[PDB]
């Protein structure tokens, strides 16, 4: 209940700042002023053209390594179990495979950007 | 499928314990030391019957024993106990460790009087 | 009855699903999926699943950032489409909105078996349990049980993650 | 100076003092002056609800001692 | 691909299938399917080309949709009963989702469209794997939940699979598409008897797998993927063509060959349940599969097609790599009819 | 002997980060199996009373079960006080 | 009365950001043998007010090629999330007491990047697109290492509750137990707030203005306020996480003062770092995070899982 | 049932229809797959929380992990398709027929 | 199809997670623990075909606990009658059902 009110207040303040910024000052908009900026000149092509990503392989690995965090964040609660040997074995086992997955992609030139 | 039987409102009446959570927490250790037998009997009834309607008299005995315990505390020294539970009540987590002097004084009072 | 907050959150969930299912430009699709993830996090929070809702929000934020990067890399067009820039996308969006409206109306104003079974509404508060005990969160205990009860699950999950890394590297090799 | 940077730092420190002090003062003002109760678990919430019920004025922070057991 | 990586991926596919086999929990079966698909996708792309990429993409889309439907059905079943065990689903809607999901995984009609294209787009080894090993897990799941299936939907899908397999195979000149349509028809035959006797399904699975393994190995040995390319094998390896012709006759279900026994047992088992019309239609439709098998046998072994001059150079070279199990698979695909009563060991 | 010594010298010269990471990981893997306090951690986890201790119905044949919390029978946490 | 507390939180934060701009200008001036703003008011105390009034009385412009809805939404999201990041911080009492405050801050921080991404894309300009892609790269670089560092540090706390960190550090600062993790966390927060030497998204020398190049006037000012508020919030979070101030339940103002001085010192440390170093290349940042920070982070995660078990020092409150 | 259950089920149905109906971009369909997974996560979490089945609180996490595996697989395939054709359109994938 | 390696080796790979009445951490019970316990013990060892018929009562109780359809129907009927009675003024709610009750611990 309180968090919804806080979020509403923050969003309302930001929107009101936008409204003040957009309705208080004098506006003189013409085509030259609103045109796209490339430091002195008209752009050759469109900004919506395909923009190559040279780190595309690391981007896919980030997806798999981000879910490693989901499996590891309950660890503080897992340390309170009675069978500490089993939990420690499985926690260490999970990180070892994460370390081995990083080592595999490193040694097979997966961390280097496309040329 | 059958009619559910319920106790009448008269049978559910008891002399209620109207002290706050801070007072209960301050007294809890000695309360569990002194009123162990009726509480344990009530819990045994509770986990054996698996029905709240079958352990009403045990609950009333629990209330009576708690009232007797608090009456003894009030009769013998209410001032150290009041200081202790006020100190406990100030804390937002009601932590024991922040009140050791008041807890001590209450402890010597109960140990010497009772 | 009581403030129907979860009803509004689930309606916004369905609205975002319609938004990214009408399939505008993947930028707006990812925006709709982010909105859906946030409102689903709120829904799960309203039933006591703080960890699960927050975790799914975090995971989908990371996934949608990767998806935005990939959309700019390989899924662009000269004029990216919005929900009102195309007859097909707008028609799909309106059809989804009105289908959800019809389902909701027929659900709360009378009792009908839509596809599986029927329901009257009454809000979510009715089906609760009013259980009163504990110095812990049962969700947290159940999730932490993965490292003591779910050894088999941890093994298969770790193997699948390592194999997934190997698989993406095998696929993106080329030649 | 180098000590002319200090007035801005002091103003920023005064601004940063306000949130925590105001939060503490508001908690005390709205919780009987005794450090607003923390309910991280259901047992603490049960204690708070029982405290509200037995207060007689529908306020959990109104504490009844041994004077309420006749 | 590094040979170690290929071995790891094949072992991961097999381990996912075995996880589906040995699990009592629906989540573990879903996990097995996910692991199987994850390790399977690279194997289709081992020889890189746009056709292999397209086949892998279509396969991934189809199997991911089937997995989503699978999980949704599992969740419905959990909702209407707090059960995770795979014994018998408690909701008809969840069971319909489960059936549609497993049929899409198997490639039953009208979810058959992906099978011929994916089979054509990959190599012969990947085709062998896809058409033999990938059927075990969904069929095992269907066997475990047999008492819950709706006979009408299952039998409709089976009859459609048989009809569409025959009709599609009638029109093919590429050998991989012929094998894919044959696989669709055989899957229809297998799923026709599942609501009545799972032992018959297992027997049909074993015989179909044996025949398909023998046929794919014979196609690898004579490295041909089209009808006209296989037409040249007589001028280099007549024994291979003769064995191919006999195996094709066995696949058509002609007595006294092995391929006849599963159809015979399925027909008699269905007649035990007062089902007469549908087995009759099933055999009359498998006549089409026999027809295009006979066309392939005409073009491959029973007549001699013209050859090229460069075959003389091939005459001087033997096969460097030999397949160890090809001889056994041919014998089991042809000469096992007298050993029929051994099917009691399958139950 | 000398081959591994030269390999470790080269690794320390070129990749001290990886050397430190492997050393810390190996220590974290092996040290817990040799520690005498792991059992103390297990016992501390076991000694935390999360739920209510349900009493047993006395039948006259439980000499090792207390009839009151302050009775000498039952587990003792004296080891924890001095730890 | 709760809205009073919300305002007493948000408004002083905005004032602190406004004067942090002046503190930055003066500190970087004095490290560069000059003075910085000292004319607009005594010691330049009126400079932030003049800057804000000039910015909000200037004309905002919509680019002709821009996508209007996302263009307007992005600064709103940035400023609102920057304000929202402060509600679970215990100073020593939080406005919103959460069981999982750290992970909530993680999720909100992860969501904050989309303001930069969407502003860069909706500007429909090449430099803004380059800035947005650099932001994607930066998040991919730092996210996993930052989260695992939080996990390893909080393993000694016993929960994800921010107020428990005060109790955990009643006798000693957590830094004396996890200083390598503290250094890596400090660098990760430098990268997370797009601050030098990791100020890649704006990239002023290389990309002119980067993601916010199209923005002018009031909308531009909100991006600036969001960035500076995020800097202050991150430094305050670091102070709570690694420098535990002693809290007296009967005198919380002492804790508040100690907290404020520590977070001011950390903010000045950021300012010093900006004044001291050149800029990374944005592939070098990812190589640093994935080849040096990630292995040590994994090893120290293993070590911090094993250590409480080895020494029988597991914290309470499952 | 609660009406939230119907809302989540219709979210799943809408995402499934969105996947089954294809526009030009391959990426849009991957988003529909992710949406189906999100709806499955929400529904399973609600069912598990309502019935207080403690041990399956970890099951949605496994669901999320295999969702990430699926998304990585789809993105890799999209990379290869776009490298082949310079575009992620589905109509370019027509070399193989029935 | 189903090779029961777990039963042959006594491994318990995933059987700990199949049912709601099976050894939850900290002995936290399921909301329908007793109904499922009764239904499982009714149907044990008699086969699936008989379990459906001779144990339909226990399964019906378990499903009612799970989804609470009949309870919601009864509550809806009671509240509809209550609203109908108030709208004509024949019935008045008691003070303890209007927010003026005397609370008890
Ligand atoms: C039920 C229906 C759902 C209601 C939708 C909500 C309201 C949005 C509709 C108004 C925006 C469109 C106006 C417009 O086109 O130009 C304005 C107008 C016309 O300009 P123009 O140059 O003449 O013509 C431009 C072209 O026509 C076209 O120019 P364009 O390229 O800008 O067109 C794109 C635009 C056009 O819109 C459409 O195509 C149709 C509108 C349907 C959109 C719904 C799709 C579903 C998306 C997900 C669900 C979101 C929640 C919806 C449910 C409501 C309940 C909250 O689509 C959008 O971008 C709208 C996106 C809204 C989502 C914002 C949420 C923020 C996410 C933050 C993180 C989330 C955390 C987790 C939670 O210019 C102005 O007036 C200045 C800008 C004013 C915009 C103010 C801010 C945008 C609206 C706020 C969103 C609501 C947040 C709460
Ligand atoms: C019952 C149902 C009826 C039968 C079932 C249906 C049969 C269909 C089977 C098709 C198999 C496909 C195949 O293998 O190749 C097709 C192959 C055609 O290929 P090709 O033209 O000859 O040349 C292909 C070359 O290999 C070109 O490739 P290359 O140049 O890279 O050569 C590498 C080659 C040479 O290999 C090497 O180089 C060896 C080097 C060793 C590397 C060390 C790697 C170990 C590390 C990985 C560990 C992973 C563990 C997984 C952990 C999971 C955790 C949950 O390796 C292979 O060819 C593949 C190796 C196959 C591995 C088999 C091992 C069994 C795995 C069992 C897993 C279950 C674990 C427990 C599960 C518990 C539940 C969770 O077909 C045949 O050769 C004849 C068919 C034989 C089928 C079996 C006969 C029927 C049953 C008797
Ligand atoms: C190497 O050169 C450079 C510098 O060195 C000289 C810089 O400083 C520098 C940083 C930019 C400076 C010029 C600082 C600019 C100051 C801000 C833009 C002003 C922001 C102040 C307001 C918008 C905050 C709001 C104003 C209120 C008073 C706060 C309270 C809010 C109410 C609701 C109450 C840059 C980029 C630079 O390039
Ligand atoms: C810091 C956070 C808190 C902020 C609190 C203040 C929030 C302010 C929000 C922004 C509003 C203030 C902006 C400046 C004043 C408003 C002026 C403008 O926005 O309104 C005009 C509204 O004009 C309307 O188009 C027509 C006027 C008549 C409208 C009739 C509505 C009903 C009136 C009925 C008359 C009888 C009385 C009814 C009211 C009681 C349109 O202005 P326009 O010229 O485009 O813009 C140029 C701006 N300049 C000139 C100041 C530079
Ligand atoms: C027959 C051939 C065997 C070898 C090949 C098999 C291939 C599969 C991989 C391994 C088989 C899985 C068997 C392990 C099942 C886990 C359950 C069993 O081991 O007991 C656990 C014992 O824990 C053990 O430590 C299991 C961990 C050992 C496995 C980790 C490394 C081995 C995996 C290697 C293959 C995985 C992929 C490749 C990685 C290199 C838990 O017992 P405990 O906690 O007391 O009590 C639980 C009951 N409670 C909850 C009420 C308290
Ligand atoms: C968050 C930090 C800042 C917070 C935002 C609030 C800033 C408050 C500053 C108020 C200063 C007063 C504003 C004056 C400038 C307004 C814009 C302007 O200059 O327009 C001048 C314009 C010129 O028009 P013409 O001469 O007819 O045409 C010439 C061209 N053909 O004249 C006007 O329109 C004057 C209108 C009066 C302005 C209203 C000011 C009232 C104060 C509102 C403050 C809002 C607080 C929130
Ligand atoms: C946006 C992302 C939403 C995330 C909000 C997280 C807030 C939070 O974590 O507070 C948790 C708090 C308490 O949890 P505990 O830690 O267990 O402590 C109390 C128990 N004693 O939970 C709550 O208060 C739940 C309140 C309702 C949830 C809020 C849902 C917000 C969803 C955002 C939707 C946006 C509006 C709709 C349209 C969106 C786009 C137009
Ligand atoms: C409902 C479905 C029921 C399925 C019944 C299937 C019947 C089995 C017979 C299959 C015949 C298939 C013939 C065919 O498809 O094409 C006709 C064929 C095409 O020539 P191709 O070799 O394929 O190409 C050469 C040029 N490139 O043209 C011909 O000349 C056919 C010559 C041989 C035809 C033999 C037909 C003999 C039929 C005998 C009567 C009984 C047939 C079965 C039905 C019985 C009546 C109920
Ligand atoms: C003052 C009178 C108020 C009128 C409001 C009209 C708003 C409008 O659309 O007008 C466009 C207006 C001014 O443009 P012009 O018409 O060209 O110039 C005006 C001067 N003649 O532009 C704006 O200011 C738009 C401002 C945005 C409105 C606020 C609503 C946006 C809501 C954002 C929701 C997203 C939240 C994201 C974070 C939350 C997630 C937890
Ligand atoms: C048993 C512990 C296991 C668990 C703990 C480890 C957890 C995290 C650590 C593992 C993370 C993965 C690291 C993967 C290593 C990749 C190696 C590699 O290929 O990098 C080489 C460089 O690294 C090498 O030199 C190859 C290996 C060298 C040895 C590395 C450490 C091996 C073990 C050393 C210490 C052993 C244990 C400590 C004992 C200390 C002695 C008392 C290439 O460098 P580039 O960045 O590409 O160059 C670009 C600019 N030229």
From Swiss-Prot, chain A:
Signal peptide: none annotated. Core subunit of the mitochondrial membrane respiratory chain NADH dehydrogenase (Complex I) which catalyzes electron transfer from NADH through the respiratory chain, using ubiquinone as an electron acceptor. Essential for the catalytic activity of complex I. The keyword Membrane applies. GO terms for cellular component: mitochondrial inner membrane; respiratory chain complex I. It is a multi-pass membrane protein. Belongs to the complex I subunit 3 family. Core subunit of respiratory chain NADH dehydrogenase (Complex I) which is composed of 45 different subunits. Interacts with TMEM186. Interacts with TMEM242. GO terms for molecular function: NADH dehydrogenase (ubiquinone) activity. Gene3D superfamilies: NADH:ubiquinone/plastoquinone oxidoreductase, chain 3. The chain crosses the membrane at residues 3-23, 55-75, 86-106. PANTHER family: NADH-UBIQUINONE OXIDOREDUCTASE CHAIN 3. Pfam families: Oxidored_q4. This is NADH-ubiquinone oxidoreductase chain 3. It is found in: Mitochondrion inner membrane. The keyword Secreted does not apply. Keywords: Electron transport, Membrane, Mitochondrion, Mitochondrion inner membrane, NAD, Respiratory chain, Translocase, Transmembrane, Transmembrane helix, Transport, Ubiquinone. It catalyses: a ubiquinone + NADH + 5 H(+)(in) = a ubiquinol + NAD(+) + 4 H(+)(out). Its EC number is 7.1.1.2. InterPro entries: NADH_UbQ/plastoQ_OxRdtase_su3 (IPR000440), NDAH_ubi_oxred_su3_sf (IPR038430). GO terms for biological process: mitochondrial electron transport, NADH to ubiquinone. Its main location: mitochondrion.
From Swiss-Prot, chain C:
Keywords: Electron transport, Membrane, Mitochondrion, Mitochondrion inner membrane, NAD, Respiratory chain, Translocase, Transmembrane, Transmembrane helix, Transport, Ubiquinone. The chain crosses the membrane at residues 1-21, 25-45, 47-67, 88-108, 149-169. One of its GO terms (biological process) is mitochondrial electron transport, NADH to ubiquinone. GO terms for molecular function: NADH dehydrogenase (ubiquinone) activity. It holds the Pfam family Oxidored_q3. It comes from the Eukaryota. It is a multi-pass membrane protein. It is found in: Mitochondrion inner membrane. It catalyses: a ubiquinone + NADH + 5 H(+)(in) = a ubiquinol + NAD(+) + 4 H(+)(out). GO terms for cellular component: mitochondrial inner membrane; mitochondrion; respiratory chain complex I. Its main location: mitochondrion. Coiled coil: none annotated. Its EC number is 7.1.1.2. Core subunit of respiratory chain NADH dehydrogenase (Complex I) which is composed of 45 different subunits. Core subunit of the mitochondrial membrane respiratory chain NADH dehydrogenase (Complex I) which catalyzes electron transfer from NADH through the respiratory chain, using ubiquinone as an electron acceptor. Essential for the catalytic activity and assembly of complex I. Belongs to the complex I subunit 6 family. This is NADH-ubiquinone oxidoreductase chain 6.
Curated annotation (Swiss-Prot), chain E:
GO terms for biological process: mitochondrial electron transport, NADH to ubiquinone; mitochondrial respiratory chain complex I assembly; reactive oxygen species metabolic process. It catalyses: a ubiquinone + NADH + 5 H(+)(in) = a ubiquinol + NAD(+) + 4 H(+)(out). Its EC number is 7.1.1.2. Keywords: Electron transport, Membrane, Mitochondrion, Mitochondrion inner membrane, NAD, Respiratory chain, Translocase, Transmembrane, Transmembrane helix, Transport, Ubiquinone. It is found in: Mitochondrion inner membrane. One of its GO terms (cellular component) is respiratory chain complex I. It is a multi-pass membrane protein. GO terms for molecular function: NADH dehydrogenase (ubiquinone) activity. Core subunit of the mitochondrial membrane respiratory chain NADH dehydrogenase (Complex I) which catalyzes electron transfer from NADH through the respiratory chain, using ubiquinone as an electron acceptor. Essential for the catalytic activity and assembly of complex I. Core subunit of respiratory chain NADH dehydrogenase (Complex I) which is composed of 45 different subunits. Interacts with TMEM242. PANTHER family: NADH-UBIQUINONE OXIDOREDUCTASE CHAIN 2. This is NADH-ubiquinone oxidoreductase chain 2. It comes from Sus scrofa.
Swiss-Prot record, chain G:
It catalyses: a ubiquinone + NADH + 5 H(+)(in) = a ubiquinol + NAD(+) + 4 H(+)(out). One of its GO terms (cellular component) is mitochondrial inner membrane. The keyword Mitochondrion applies. It is found in: Mitochondrion inner membrane. GO terms for biological process: aerobic respiration; mitochondrial electron transport, NADH to ubiquinone; mitochondrial respiratory chain complex I assembly. Belongs to the complex I subunit 1 family. This is NADH-ubiquinone oxidoreductase chain 1. It comes from Sus scrofa (Pig). The lineage of its organism: Eukaryota, Metazoa, Chordata, Craniata, Vertebrata. The gene is MT-ND1.
